[PDB]
Amino acid sequence: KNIESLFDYSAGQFEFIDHLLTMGVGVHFAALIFFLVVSQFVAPKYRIATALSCIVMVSAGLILNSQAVMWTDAYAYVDGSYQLQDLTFSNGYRYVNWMATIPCLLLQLLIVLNLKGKELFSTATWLILAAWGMIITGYVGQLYEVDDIAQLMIWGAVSTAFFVVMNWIVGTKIFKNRATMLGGTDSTITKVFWLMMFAWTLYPIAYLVPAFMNNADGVVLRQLLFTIADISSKVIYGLMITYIAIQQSAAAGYVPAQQALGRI
Ligand SMILES: *C\C=C(C)/C=C/C=C(C)/C=C/C1=C(C)CCCC1(C)C
Ligand SMILES: CCCCCCCC/C=C\CCCCCCCC(=O)O
Ligand SMILES: CCCCCCCC/C=C\CCCCCCCC(=O)O
Numbered sequence: 018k019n020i021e022s023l024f025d026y027s028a029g030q031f032e033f034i035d036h037l038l039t040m041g042v043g044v045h046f047a048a049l050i051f052f053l054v055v056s057q058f059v060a061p062k063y064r065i066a067t068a069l070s071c072i073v074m075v076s077a078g079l080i081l082n083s084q085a086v087m088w089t090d091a092y093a094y095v096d097g098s099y100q101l102q103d104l105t106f107s108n109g110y111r112y113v114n115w116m117a118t119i120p121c122l123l124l125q126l127l128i129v130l131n132l133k134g135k136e137l138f139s140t141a142t143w144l145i146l147a148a149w150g151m152i153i154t155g156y157v158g159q160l161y162e163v164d165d166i167a168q169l170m171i172w173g174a175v176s177t178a179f180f181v182v183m184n185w186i187v188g189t190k191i192f193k194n195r196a197t198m199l200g201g202t203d204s205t206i207t208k209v210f211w212l213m214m215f216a217w218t219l220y221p222i223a224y225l226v227p228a229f230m231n232n233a234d235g236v237v238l239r240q241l242l243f244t245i246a247d248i249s250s251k252v253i254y255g256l257m258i259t260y261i262a263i264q265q266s267a268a269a270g271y272v273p274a275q276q277a278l279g280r281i
């Protein structure tokens with residue numbers, strides 16, 4: 018039912034997909050390490066934001082690692098191309114982890130926006146359920162990518178629905194609590210949000226490849242966009258949130274934070 022299952026890949030598309038996935042594993046487990054290291058440069062009041070990008074890097078990596086092995090498991094060169102075997106490839110696990118990495122990405126944003134008390138857990142919930150409502154409805158849509166573009170669209174429509182509302186929440190929070198930000202970081206955070214806007218919007222694009230390019234080069238397209246989307250929303254976004262967590266820590270009087278940026 019995945020459109021990946023429909024085609025016999027030329028040797029260069031397979032190998033391209035495989036490297037897409039493997040290099041994805043590489044970069045997540047690599048920022049993973051960096052985040053760990055700079056965790057000591059963040060004050061106790063902001064340390065969970067870097068800690069959450071580590072869960073994302075390992076969540077993202079192990080899923081990408083799962084998919085890479087699964088890629089090569091499912092396919093064998095037969096008779097001039099890579100042909101599906103008795104195992105199948107699927108994007109489904111991308112989704113489930115998005116069920117999981119997205120809450121982490123929001124809490125860390127909400128964290129560096131300086132939300133204490135019932136504000137942050139109340140906003141955290143509405144954003145997860147909206148986000149979760151986006152992912153779940155997108156999943157059921159992508160169950161029909163082969164069999165019913167009709168449903169892929171309407172489920173796609175419901176999902177994007179959720180995307181708009183959830184993005185509306187985030188930005189309202191950014192602009193208000195921007196005030197409370199230390200270190201020139203009020204500026205940076207608004208750039209955090211444009212980054213996510215773009216990054217996140219490549220995923221819908223990647224979900225409509227079946228209706229405008231049901232062919233094997235569409236497979237690779239989709240995997241390319243996912244790879245870019247994942248690097249932007251996960252890795253690069255994490256570094257920016259890392260950047261803001263330390264800058265405030267130093268403004269607040271975390272000596273190990275001033276030390277770190279004072280070295281540069
Ligand atoms: C790992 C982090 C992120 C932010 C991946 C997020 C995925 C989206 C923002 C995708 C939204 C989609 C839409 C809006 C519609 C079709 C189903 C999707 C979930 C792909
Ligand atoms: C084994 C996978 C094949 C690809 C090799 C991967 C090489 C990794 C290169 C750098 C990691 C990308 C993230 C940049 C480093 C984050 C630290 C920083 O610049 O602040
Ligand atoms: C900032 C996110 C960047 C993520 C890195 C993705 C790297 C892709 C590299 C360039 C793609 C151009 C190579 C052309 C692919 C050949 C397609 C084919 O074999 O049919």
Ligand SMILES: [Cl-]
Nearest residue numbers: 060061062063
């Ligand atoms: Cl603190």
Ligand SMILES: [Cl-]
Nearest residue numbers: 076077114118
């Ligand atoms: Cl993930």
